[PDB]
What does this fold into?
Amino acid sequence: PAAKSIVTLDVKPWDDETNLEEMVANVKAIEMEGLTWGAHQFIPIGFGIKKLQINCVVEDDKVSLDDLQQSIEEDEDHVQSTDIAAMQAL
Amino acid sequence: KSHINVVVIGHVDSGKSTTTGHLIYKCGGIDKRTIEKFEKEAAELGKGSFKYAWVLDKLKAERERGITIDIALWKFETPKYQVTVIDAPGHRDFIKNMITGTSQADCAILIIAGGVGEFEAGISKDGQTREHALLAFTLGVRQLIVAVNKMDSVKWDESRFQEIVKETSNFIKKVGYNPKTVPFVPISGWNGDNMIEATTNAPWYKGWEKETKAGVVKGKTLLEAIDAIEQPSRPTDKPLRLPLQDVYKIGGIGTVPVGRVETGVIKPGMVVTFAPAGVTTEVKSVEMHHEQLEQGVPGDNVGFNVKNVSVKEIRRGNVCGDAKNDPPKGCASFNATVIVLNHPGQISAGYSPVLDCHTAHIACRFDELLEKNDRRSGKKLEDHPKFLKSGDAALVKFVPSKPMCVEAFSEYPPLGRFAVRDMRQTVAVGVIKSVDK
It folds into this structure.
């Protein structure tokens, strides 16, 4: 079977006014062979700002995390940056 | 309890994930509700009796479907520690994360399969396992524990265990670890042998041992070997260093940078400087989560409000520190010991790939290949090598293409280790030795 890894990504908005529901909808709309979106939640990071923490399960041989991050960041209207908060073997 | 980070490494057939799952599960690290529903199901299948491994298989399936909630990090408490464990993924992009990631391990646990075929397959020179061990060693993870798994597959034979210990000792010695300071624990992750309770399947087993600077430490189980990890020291005494991840403009508040305190402490009222921006201001307030902190310590990801600064004057990659206590600065260049990983090709002076250091992402030129060295001792073997190839350790002079703030690894670890990206992977790992500020 294909080797897989669980990845938890932090997706940050531009301010305390960024529409977070649109932000996560746009992330989850991204399609990649070997990529499966998982659970997500919004976490307060201070001063009213909230970051999106979303898990995904990827097939090691098919999904480039660099490419995935770059794709998410194309949504400049909502996303300021992304970071890998955690990675775990499945 | 004190906190420590552990990274579990091993071949795909080592059973390291089953072993890791068992520890978290039986050390109360798994969510109560989760365990209940999966144990209830595990019981229903038969007359009632169930193996812990079956419960873990069901959890693995839920995790695989992307249903399990919250961050992908295991945590559990031992008698002495609060442990965060990273079961190392096989994904090639994990390499960069291991290097620049936030959770640096205090100890690595190498899980090895005892079976004849599986054992050899795991200690291959070009295997991902050796690469992870080499990376751990290079990044300063000096404590190591070896667990020889699947002992049941070899009928808990003493000779086989002894031969595995001998070959594995050679394996880790070549990486750089001193086998005498490493406990070798025979276990069966699946069955629980020597995990939390001592095994009853090996009369010849008297326990593991390891030499420390004060004496010899002994124990029987893997849990005891983890509890025996020597207390690591934190950088709370050093000057502040807080790499910026993001910067926000909040109406009525002002500019709000956000990042992780790597070293030192940040407090409201403190005067700070942002390098290489060159901006100095007072910290109005500090917040983390839903609370207004009195101080941010190493490990805390915080957002803080500063005045008289536009969200455009500071940005991701910049480093915040104390204005008067060894304030951070940009560099003209920096020298680093570089370990070239397995990648096709040769590196020559002029090479200018992108480097990831803390939150900085900047192309830096391998300005000069100063020396090629013996990796483990650091001894200079040649002056100005003409090129570097996979496996080489060398001292390289780097010149960043854009203003960049870095530190010597011996002074500020989090700002002194970096990953070199190219050819769709990390081609090298670096440890900064000096900086020309």
User: Anything to note?
Assistant: The interface with chain B takes residues 3-8, 12, 14-16, 36-39, 41, 43-49, 53, 55-58, 60, 64-66, 80-81, 83-90 of chain A (CB under 8 Å).
